[PDB]
Ligand binder design. Structure first.
Ligand SMILES: CC(C)c1ccc(NC(=O)[C@H](Cc2ccccc2)NC(=O)[C@H](CCCC[NH3+])NC(=O)C(F)(F)F)cc1
Ligand SMILES: [Ca+2]
Length: 240
């Protein structure tokens, strides 16, 4: 998160860190959203490498014991059947991970509330992106969870010439684009939380930014529109 602020410890409890095994250690690669005590929603591109992965719920400071973390292994990865590694602009950048154990819910670990199927947010809707990714373009991971106020840019505006054009599809949410605040590498998979009827709901899964830089005027951060995937999500959790 470029142009972010430090999140309070309990503000966003459905946020997880997706980490992979590096030598004796574990490194953060992506965010996610806890959606069931044993299921995480993240972006499909986050698990395209065949790495050993773990999820950390209740995490705040990556590099420090918070006294609130639960570590759980990933048991099963279901990516969207239509996801293509070579074409992120096609969409379908969503995956579901079955955890090896059910996590315990407390004020640090909560399930994220999903939107009703088909819900589109009006332009300039109040949303927040959270994550541990790069705080500058080509910078470094944050060690505490950051948040940034990122209002949505609706599809007409976002798919216009000036903006993402043809690269954005109606299965995506655009948010931000002011050249100051943005999602950046390592925030992929994470939540875009939007305040709806007095309730925060997870409307985006972070998917991409520009090839030119994270915080670029008129190139909003792009998210998988979660409400486009509610029947697939339910259908996976029911069977698996
Ligand atoms: C400055 C220049 C090197 C530059 C190049 C690319 C970007 N970023 C990008 O275009 C964004 C990174 C990103 C994702 C989500 C949120 C924020 C940022 N990258 C993506 O869309 C890829 C998805 C690859 C799909 C194929 N397997 N994301 C990533 O792999 C991740 F996790 F590291 F962030 C930003 C800057
Ligand atoms: Ca920690």
């Amino acid at each position: 998160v470029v142009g972010g602020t430090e999140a309070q410890r309990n503000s966003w409890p459905s946020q997880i860190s997706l980490q992979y095994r590096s030598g004796s250690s574990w490194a953060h690669t992506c965010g996610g959203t806890l959606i069931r005590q044993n299921w995480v929603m993240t972006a499909a591109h986050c698990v395209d490498r065949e790495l050993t992965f773990r999820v950390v719920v209740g995490e705040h400071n990556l590099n420090q014991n918070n006294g609130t973390e639960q570590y759980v292994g990933v048991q099963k990865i279901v990516v969207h059947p239509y996801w293509n590694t070579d074409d992120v602009a096609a969409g379908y950048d969503i995956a579901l991970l079955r955890l090896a154990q059910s996590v315990t819910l407390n004020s640090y670990v909560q399930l994220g509330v999903l939107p009703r199927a088909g819900t589109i947010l009006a332009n300039n809707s109040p949303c927040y992106i959270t994550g541990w990714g790069l705080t500058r373009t080509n910078g470094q991971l944050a060690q505490t969870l950051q948040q940034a106020y990122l209002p949505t840019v609706d599809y007409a505006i976002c798919s216009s010439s000036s903006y993402w054009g043809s690269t954005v599809k109606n299965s995506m949410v655009c948010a931000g684009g002011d050249g100051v605040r943005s999602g950046c590498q390592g925030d992929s998979g994470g939540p875009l939380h939007c305040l709806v009827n007095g309730q925060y709901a997870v409307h985006g899964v972070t998917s991409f930014v520009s090839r030119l830089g994270c915080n670029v005027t008129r190139k909003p951060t792009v998210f998988t529109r979660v409400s486009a995937y509610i029947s697939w999500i339910n259908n996976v959790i029911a069977s698996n």
